[PDB]
mmCIF file with all atom_site columns, C-alpha atoms (C1' of nucleotides) and ligand atoms in Angstrom:
data_model
loop_
_atom_site.group_PDB
_atom_site.id
_atom_site.type_symbol
_atom_site.label_atom_id
_atom_site.label_alt_id
_atom_site.label_comp_id
_atom_site.label_asym_id
_atom_site.label_entity_id
_atom_site.label_seq_id
_atom_site.pdbx_PDB_ins_code
_atom_site.Cartn_x
_atom_site.Cartn_y
_atom_site.Cartn_z
_atom_site.occupancy
_atom_site.B_iso_or_equiv
_atom_site.pdbx_formal_charge
_atom_site.auth_seq_id
_atom_site.auth_comp_id
_atom_site.auth_asym_id
_atom_site.auth_atom_id
_atom_site.pdbx_PDB_model_num
ATOM   1   C  CA    . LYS A 1 1  ? 251.441 211.858 143.352 1.00 0.00 ? 3  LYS A CA    1
ATOM   2   C  CA    . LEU A 1 2  ? 250.840 213.656 140.074 1.00 0.00 ? 4  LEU A CA    1
ATOM   3   C  CA    . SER A 1 3  ? 252.540 216.996 139.507 1.00 0.00 ? 5  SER A CA    1
ATOM   4   C  CA    . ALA A 1 4  ? 250.702 220.039 138.199 1.00 0.00 ? 6  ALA A CA    1
ATOM   5   C  CA    . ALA A 1 5  ? 253.875 220.993 136.313 1.00 0.00 ? 7  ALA A CA    1
ATOM   6   C  CA    . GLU A 1 6  ? 253.739 217.786 134.261 1.00 0.00 ? 8  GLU A CA    1
ATOM   7   C  CA    . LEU A 1 7  ? 249.974 217.989 133.728 1.00 0.00 ? 9  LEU A CA    1
ATOM   8   C  CA    . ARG A 1 8  ? 250.432 221.554 132.466 1.00 0.00 ? 10 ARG A CA    1
ATOM   9   C  CA    . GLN A 1 9  ? 252.416 220.094 129.548 1.00 0.00 ? 11 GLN A CA    1
ATOM   10  C  CA    . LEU A 1 10 ? 249.624 217.668 128.585 1.00 0.00 ? 12 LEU A CA    1
ATOM   11  C  CA    . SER A 1 11 ? 246.844 218.693 126.214 1.00 0.00 ? 13 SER A CA    1
ATOM   12  C  CA    . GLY A 1 12 ? 243.140 218.903 127.004 1.00 0.00 ? 14 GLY A CA    1
ATOM   13  C  CA    . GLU A 1 13 ? 242.005 215.542 125.645 1.00 0.00 ? 15 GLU A CA    1
ATOM   14  C  CA    . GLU A 1 14 ? 244.766 213.569 127.364 1.00 0.00 ? 16 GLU A CA    1
ATOM   15  C  CA    . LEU A 1 15 ? 244.115 215.563 130.550 1.00 0.00 ? 17 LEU A CA    1
ATOM   16  C  CA    . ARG A 1 16 ? 240.463 214.483 130.448 1.00 0.00 ? 18 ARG A CA    1
ATOM   17  C  CA    . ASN A 1 17 ? 241.499 210.899 129.720 1.00 0.00 ? 19 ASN A CA    1
ATOM   18  C  CA    . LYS A 1 18 ? 243.616 211.247 132.864 1.00 0.00 ? 20 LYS A CA    1
ATOM   19  C  CA    . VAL A 1 19 ? 240.544 212.486 134.761 1.00 0.00 ? 21 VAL A CA    1
ATOM   20  C  CA    . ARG A 1 20 ? 238.509 209.466 133.644 1.00 0.00 ? 22 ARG A CA    1
ATOM   21  C  CA    . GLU A 1 21 ? 241.333 207.021 134.410 1.00 0.00 ? 23 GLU A CA    1
ATOM   22  C  CA    . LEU A 1 22 ? 241.679 208.506 137.898 1.00 0.00 ? 24 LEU A CA    1
ATOM   23  C  CA    . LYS A 1 23 ? 237.918 208.222 138.442 1.00 0.00 ? 25 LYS A CA    1
ATOM   24  C  CA    . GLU A 1 24 ? 238.052 204.557 137.408 1.00 0.00 ? 26 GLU A CA    1
ATOM   25  C  CA    . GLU A 1 25 ? 240.984 203.928 139.756 1.00 0.00 ? 27 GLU A CA    1
ATOM   26  C  CA    . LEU A 1 26 ? 239.107 205.614 142.618 1.00 0.00 ? 28 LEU A CA    1
ATOM   27  C  CA    . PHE A 1 27 ? 236.091 203.411 141.851 1.00 0.00 ? 29 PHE A CA    1
ATOM   28  C  CA    . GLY A 1 28 ? 238.249 200.290 142.014 1.00 0.00 ? 30 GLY A CA    1
ATOM   29  C  CA    . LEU A 1 29 ? 239.920 201.445 145.228 1.00 0.00 ? 31 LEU A CA    1
ATOM   30  C  CA    . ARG A 1 30 ? 236.552 202.062 146.886 1.00 0.00 ? 32 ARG A CA    1
ATOM   31  C  CA    . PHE A 1 31 ? 235.319 198.616 145.856 1.00 0.00 ? 33 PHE A CA    1
ATOM   32  C  CA    . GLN A 1 32 ? 238.475 197.000 147.276 1.00 0.00 ? 34 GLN A CA    1
ATOM   33  C  CA    . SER A 1 33 ? 237.997 198.993 150.486 1.00 0.00 ? 35 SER A CA    1
ATOM   34  C  CA    . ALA A 1 34 ? 234.401 197.790 150.769 1.00 0.00 ? 36 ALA A CA    1
ATOM   35  C  CA    . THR A 1 35 ? 235.282 194.138 150.130 1.00 0.00 ? 37 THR A CA    1
ATOM   36  C  CA    . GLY A 1 36 ? 238.166 193.932 152.640 1.00 0.00 ? 38 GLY A CA    1
ATOM   37  C  CA    . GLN A 1 37 ? 241.110 194.428 150.250 1.00 0.00 ? 39 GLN A CA    1
ATOM   38  C  CA    . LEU A 1 38 ? 243.152 197.650 149.891 1.00 0.00 ? 40 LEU A CA    1
ATOM   39  C  CA    . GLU A 1 39 ? 246.155 197.439 152.181 1.00 0.00 ? 41 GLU A CA    1
ATOM   40  C  CA    . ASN A 1 40 ? 247.198 200.738 150.528 1.00 0.00 ? 42 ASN A CA    1
ATOM   41  C  CA    . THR A 1 41 ? 244.779 203.226 152.081 1.00 0.00 ? 43 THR A CA    1
ATOM   42  C  CA    . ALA A 1 42 ? 246.824 206.331 151.200 1.00 0.00 ? 44 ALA A CA    1
ATOM   43  C  CA    . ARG A 1 43 ? 246.218 205.923 147.463 1.00 0.00 ? 45 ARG A CA    1
ATOM   44  C  CA    . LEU A 1 44 ? 242.495 206.246 148.225 1.00 0.00 ? 46 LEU A CA    1
ATOM   45  C  CA    . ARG A 1 45 ? 243.022 209.918 149.136 1.00 0.00 ? 47 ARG A CA    1
ATOM   46  C  CA    . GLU A 1 46 ? 245.911 210.513 146.727 1.00 0.00 ? 48 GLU A CA    1
ATOM   47  C  CA    . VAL A 1 47 ? 243.833 209.607 143.661 1.00 0.00 ? 49 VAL A CA    1
ATOM   48  C  CA    . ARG A 1 48 ? 241.253 212.222 144.671 1.00 0.00 ? 50 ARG A CA    1
ATOM   49  C  CA    . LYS A 1 49 ? 244.038 214.769 145.129 1.00 0.00 ? 51 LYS A CA    1
ATOM   50  C  CA    . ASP A 1 50 ? 245.240 213.848 141.620 1.00 0.00 ? 52 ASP A CA    1
ATOM   51  C  CA    . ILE A 1 51 ? 241.727 214.444 140.264 1.00 0.00 ? 53 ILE A CA    1
ATOM   52  C  CA    . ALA A 1 52 ? 241.792 217.839 141.973 1.00 0.00 ? 54 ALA A CA    1
ATOM   53  C  CA    . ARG A 1 53 ? 245.169 218.611 140.375 1.00 0.00 ? 55 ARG A CA    1
ATOM   54  C  CA    . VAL A 1 54 ? 243.944 217.785 136.871 1.00 0.00 ? 56 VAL A CA    1
ATOM   55  C  CA    . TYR A 1 55 ? 240.804 219.859 137.429 1.00 0.00 ? 57 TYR A CA    1
ATOM   56  C  CA    . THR A 1 56 ? 242.958 222.781 138.585 1.00 0.00 ? 58 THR A CA    1
ATOM   57  C  CA    . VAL A 1 57 ? 245.055 222.587 135.409 1.00 0.00 ? 59 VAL A CA    1
ATOM   58  C  CA    . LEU A 1 58 ? 241.983 222.308 133.171 1.00 0.00 ? 60 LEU A CA    1
ATOM   59  C  CA    . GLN A 1 59 ? 240.213 225.214 134.868 1.00 0.00 ? 61 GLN A CA    1
ATOM   60  C  CA    . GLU A 1 60 ? 243.267 227.477 134.800 1.00 0.00 ? 62 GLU A CA    1
ATOM   61  C  CA    . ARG A 1 61 ? 243.391 226.807 131.066 1.00 0.00 ? 63 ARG A CA    1
ATOM   62  C  CA    . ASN A 1 62 ? 239.657 227.525 130.757 1.00 0.00 ? 64 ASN A CA    1
ATOM   63  C  CA    . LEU A 1 63 ? 239.826 230.742 132.808 1.00 0.00 ? 65 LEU A CA    1
ATOM   64  C  CA    . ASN A 1 64 ? 243.044 231.892 131.056 1.00 0.00 ? 66 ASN A CA    1
ATOM   65  C  CA    . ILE A 1 65 ? 245.017 231.919 134.318 1.00 0.00 ? 67 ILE A CA    1
ATOM   66  C  CA    . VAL A 1 66 ? 247.708 230.130 132.285 1.00 0.00 ? 68 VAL A CA    1
ATOM   67  C  CA    . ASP A 1 67 ? 247.823 230.102 128.485 1.00 0.00 ? 69 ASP A CA    1
ATOM   68  C  CA    . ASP A 1 68 ? 246.015 227.147 126.917 1.00 0.00 ? 70 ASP A CA    1
ATOM   69  C  CA    . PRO A 1 69 ? 248.118 225.123 124.380 1.00 0.00 ? 71 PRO A CA    1
ATOM   70  C  "C1'" . C   B 2 1  ? 225.920 176.290 260.667 1.00 0.00 ? 1  C   B "C1'" 1
ATOM   71  C  "C1'" . A   B 2 2  ? 221.539 180.051 260.933 1.00 0.00 ? 2  A   B "C1'" 1
ATOM   72  C  "C1'" . A   B 2 3  ? 220.365 185.328 261.723 1.00 0.00 ? 3  A   B "C1'" 1
ATOM   73  C  "C1'" . A   B 2 4  ? 220.717 190.570 260.984 1.00 0.00 ? 4  A   B "C1'" 1
ATOM   74  C  "C1'" . G   B 2 5  ? 223.040 194.055 258.026 1.00 0.00 ? 5  G   B "C1'" 1
ATOM   75  C  "C1'" . U   B 2 6  ? 226.175 196.379 254.232 1.00 0.00 ? 6  U   B "C1'" 1
ATOM   76  C  "C1'" . U   B 2 7  ? 228.274 196.788 249.604 1.00 0.00 ? 7  U   B "C1'" 1
ATOM   77  C  "C1'" . G   B 2 8  ? 228.737 195.423 244.163 1.00 0.00 ? 8  G   B "C1'" 1
ATOM   78  C  "C1'" . U   B 2 9  ? 226.420 194.995 239.058 1.00 0.00 ? 9  U   B "C1'" 1
ATOM   79  C  "C1'" . G   B 2 10 ? 226.743 196.100 230.832 1.00 0.00 ? 10 G   B "C1'" 1
ATOM   80  C  "C1'" . U   B 2 11 ? 225.600 189.231 229.013 1.00 0.00 ? 11 U   B "C1'" 1
ATOM   81  C  "C1'" . A   B 2 12 ? 220.750 194.349 225.596 1.00 0.00 ? 12 A   B "C1'" 1
ATOM   82  C  "C1'" . G   B 2 13 ? 222.090 198.931 224.556 1.00 0.00 ? 13 G   B "C1'" 1
ATOM   83  C  "C1'" . U   B 2 14 ? 223.844 204.124 225.474 1.00 0.00 ? 14 U   B "C1'" 1
ATOM   84  C  "C1'" . G   B 2 15 ? 227.028 208.688 226.686 1.00 0.00 ? 15 G   B "C1'" 1
ATOM   85  C  "C1'" . C   B 2 16 ? 231.842 211.126 226.798 1.00 0.00 ? 16 C   B "C1'" 1
ATOM   86  C  "C1'" . G   B 2 17 ? 237.056 211.154 225.405 1.00 0.00 ? 17 G   B "C1'" 1
ATOM   87  C  "C1'" . A   B 2 18 ? 241.003 209.345 222.651 1.00 0.00 ? 18 A   B "C1'" 1
ATOM   88  C  "C1'" . U   B 2 19 ? 242.512 206.668 218.403 1.00 0.00 ? 19 U   B "C1'" 1
ATOM   89  C  "C1'" . C   B 2 20 ? 241.990 204.530 213.581 1.00 0.00 ? 20 C   B "C1'" 1
ATOM   90  C  "C1'" . G   B 2 21 ? 239.310 204.632 209.123 1.00 0.00 ? 21 G   B "C1'" 1
ATOM   91  C  "C1'" . G   B 2 22 ? 235.112 205.735 205.501 1.00 0.00 ? 22 G   B "C1'" 1
ATOM   92  C  "C1'" . U   B 2 23 ? 232.188 209.399 203.106 1.00 0.00 ? 23 U   B "C1'" 1
ATOM   93  C  "C1'" . G   B 2 24 ? 232.200 214.326 201.428 1.00 0.00 ? 24 G   B "C1'" 1
ATOM   94  C  "C1'" . G   B 2 25 ? 234.630 217.846 198.493 1.00 0.00 ? 25 G   B "C1'" 1
ATOM   95  C  "C1'" . A   B 2 26 ? 235.589 222.857 201.841 1.00 0.00 ? 26 A   B "C1'" 1
ATOM   96  C  "C1'" . U   B 2 27 ? 240.455 224.983 202.237 1.00 0.00 ? 27 U   B "C1'" 1
ATOM   97  C  "C1'" . G   B 2 28 ? 245.250 226.149 200.068 1.00 0.00 ? 28 G   B "C1'" 1
ATOM   98  C  "C1'" . C   B 2 29 ? 248.108 226.555 195.509 1.00 0.00 ? 29 C   B "C1'" 1
ATOM   99  C  "C1'" . C   B 2 30 ? 247.046 226.939 190.430 1.00 0.00 ? 30 C   B "C1'" 1
ATOM   100 C  "C1'" . U   B 2 31 ? 244.693 227.796 185.109 1.00 0.00 ? 31 U   B "C1'" 1
ATOM   101 C  "C1'" . U   B 2 32 ? 243.755 226.049 177.612 1.00 0.00 ? 32 U   B "C1'" 1
ATOM   102 C  "C1'" . G   B 2 33 ? 238.652 230.727 180.791 1.00 0.00 ? 33 G   B "C1'" 1
ATOM   103 C  "C1'" . G   B 2 34 ? 236.570 235.363 181.842 1.00 0.00 ? 34 G   B "C1'" 1
ATOM   104 C  "C1'" . C   B 2 35 ? 236.163 241.101 183.331 1.00 0.00 ? 35 C   B "C1'" 1
ATOM   105 C  "C1'" . A   B 2 36 ? 237.668 246.068 182.734 1.00 0.00 ? 36 A   B "C1'" 1
ATOM   106 C  "C1'" . C   B 2 37 ? 240.543 248.942 179.759 1.00 0.00 ? 37 C   B "C1'" 1
ATOM   107 C  "C1'" . C   B 2 38 ? 244.765 251.162 176.658 1.00 0.00 ? 38 C   B "C1'" 1
ATOM   108 C  "C1'" . A   B 2 39 ? 247.280 251.843 171.705 1.00 0.00 ? 39 A   B "C1'" 1
ATOM   109 C  "C1'" . A   B 2 40 ? 246.837 251.099 166.627 1.00 0.00 ? 40 A   B "C1'" 1
ATOM   110 C  "C1'" . G   B 2 41 ? 243.598 249.636 162.871 1.00 0.00 ? 41 G   B "C1'" 1
ATOM   111 C  "C1'" . A   B 2 42 ? 238.992 248.332 160.108 1.00 0.00 ? 42 A   B "C1'" 1
ATOM   112 C  "C1'" . G   B 2 43 ? 234.599 250.423 159.921 1.00 0.00 ? 43 G   B "C1'" 1
ATOM   113 C  "C1'" . C   B 2 44 ? 230.381 247.269 156.025 1.00 0.00 ? 44 C   B "C1'" 1
ATOM   114 C  "C1'" . C   B 2 45 ? 228.811 242.256 153.622 1.00 0.00 ? 45 C   B "C1'" 1
ATOM   115 C  "C1'" . G   B 2 46 ? 225.040 240.584 149.463 1.00 0.00 ? 46 G   B "C1'" 1
ATOM   116 C  "C1'" . A   B 2 47 ? 221.955 238.564 142.723 1.00 0.00 ? 47 A   B "C1'" 1
ATOM   117 C  "C1'" . U   B 2 48 ? 229.964 237.394 140.741 1.00 0.00 ? 48 U   B "C1'" 1
ATOM   118 C  "C1'" . G   B 2 49 ? 224.411 235.492 145.554 1.00 0.00 ? 49 G   B "C1'" 1
ATOM   119 C  "C1'" . A   B 2 50 ? 225.265 237.560 151.970 1.00 0.00 ? 50 A   B "C1'" 1
ATOM   120 C  "C1'" . A   B 2 51 ? 224.704 236.925 157.542 1.00 0.00 ? 51 A   B "C1'" 1
ATOM   121 C  "C1'" . G   B 2 52 ? 223.284 232.035 159.194 1.00 0.00 ? 52 G   B "C1'" 1
ATOM   122 C  "C1'" . G   B 2 53 ? 222.794 227.131 158.481 1.00 0.00 ? 53 G   B "C1'" 1
ATOM   123 C  "C1'" . A   B 2 54 ? 221.399 221.521 156.655 1.00 0.00 ? 54 A   B "C1'" 1
ATOM   124 C  "C1'" . C   B 2 55 ? 223.867 217.505 154.836 1.00 0.00 ? 55 C   B "C1'" 1
ATOM   125 C  "C1'" . G   B 2 56 ? 228.380 215.458 153.694 1.00 0.00 ? 56 G   B "C1'" 1
ATOM   126 C  "C1'" . U   B 2 57 ? 233.812 215.334 154.099 1.00 0.00 ? 57 U   B "C1'" 1
ATOM   127 C  "C1'" . U   B 2 58 ? 239.291 211.508 157.545 1.00 0.00 ? 58 U   B "C1'" 1
ATOM   128 C  "C1'" . G   B 2 59 ? 242.115 204.719 156.314 1.00 0.00 ? 59 G   B "C1'" 1
ATOM   129 C  "C1'" . U   B 2 60 ? 238.260 203.901 160.310 1.00 0.00 ? 60 U   B "C1'" 1
ATOM   130 C  "C1'" . G   B 2 61 ? 232.965 205.061 164.690 1.00 0.00 ? 61 G   B "C1'" 1
ATOM   131 C  "C1'" . A   B 2 62 ? 231.341 209.852 166.707 1.00 0.00 ? 62 A   B "C1'" 1
ATOM   132 C  "C1'" . C   B 2 63 ? 231.844 214.973 168.030 1.00 0.00 ? 63 C   B "C1'" 1
ATOM   133 C  "C1'" . C   B 2 64 ? 234.527 219.895 167.657 1.00 0.00 ? 64 C   B "C1'" 1
ATOM   134 C  "C1'" . U   B 2 65 ? 237.584 222.788 163.943 1.00 0.00 ? 65 U   B "C1'" 1
ATOM   135 C  "C1'" . G   B 2 66 ? 238.429 223.320 158.799 1.00 0.00 ? 66 G   B "C1'" 1
ATOM   136 C  "C1'" . C   B 2 67 ? 236.584 222.339 154.137 1.00 0.00 ? 67 C   B "C1'" 1
ATOM   137 C  "C1'" . G   B 2 68 ? 232.529 221.303 149.792 1.00 0.00 ? 68 G   B "C1'" 1
ATOM   138 C  "C1'" . A   B 2 69 ? 231.493 215.644 145.473 1.00 0.00 ? 69 A   B "C1'" 1
ATOM   139 C  "C1'" . U   B 2 70 ? 238.634 219.402 143.402 1.00 0.00 ? 70 U   B "C1'" 1
ATOM   140 C  "C1'" . A   B 2 71 ? 235.210 218.288 150.284 1.00 0.00 ? 71 A   B "C1'" 1
ATOM   141 C  "C1'" . A   B 2 72 ? 241.283 218.709 157.563 1.00 0.00 ? 72 A   B "C1'" 1
ATOM   142 C  "C1'" . G   B 2 73 ? 241.924 219.922 151.298 1.00 0.00 ? 73 G   B "C1'" 1
ATOM   143 C  "C1'" . C   B 2 74 ? 243.866 221.750 144.662 1.00 0.00 ? 74 C   B "C1'" 1
ATOM   144 C  "C1'" . C   B 2 75 ? 247.262 225.543 142.201 1.00 0.00 ? 75 C   B "C1'" 1
ATOM   145 C  "C1'" . C   B 2 76 ? 250.573 229.951 141.719 1.00 0.00 ? 76 C   B "C1'" 1
ATOM   146 C  "C1'" . U   B 2 77 ? 253.795 233.174 144.527 1.00 0.00 ? 77 U   B "C1'" 1
ATOM   147 C  "C1'" . G   B 2 78 ? 257.169 234.747 148.459 1.00 0.00 ? 78 G   B "C1'" 1
ATOM   148 C  "C1'" . G   B 2 79 ? 259.119 233.140 153.203 1.00 0.00 ? 79 G   B "C1'" 1
ATOM   149 C  "C1'" . G   B 2 80 ? 261.268 229.001 156.191 1.00 0.00 ? 80 G   B "C1'" 1
ATOM   150 C  "C1'" . G   B 2 81 ? 263.448 224.760 157.034 1.00 0.00 ? 81 G   B "C1'" 1
HETATM 151 MG MG1   . MG  C 3 .  ? 236.266 213.062 196.483 1.00 0.00 ? 1  MG  C MG1   1
#
RNA sequence: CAAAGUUGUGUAGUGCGAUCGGUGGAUGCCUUGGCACCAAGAGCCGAUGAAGGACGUUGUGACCUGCGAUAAGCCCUGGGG
């Protein structure tokens, strides 16, 4: 569970690196789910919620909802 | 013993009554649903793309509800526990 408060302290480039890392983790989780692995099925949804959190932070910086560092 | 005579008939089935069941879903009692109104609102939405949908969306098979690849959900804010 990422926190939007922490992500709001990160800068844009590290936030996008976080987006890409989360996408890669979701890819790996889906492959494990397909192949019979993945005991931890909650992380499969939590990584997508984390992607949503990072997108919310990035877009609120883009739309000036919160000041962009 | 023989004669003459009389009377009787359920081993197939059936009727009526009682009794015991089956089927059926009436009756009674209800209700996550309607009907008729009352009081207060609100009286438009849409190219910043509507009304209405198609497809997808859950850990997993479908459907309803919600949502849209940020997909039964993301953030801020107040409440509450
Ligand atoms: Mg019945």
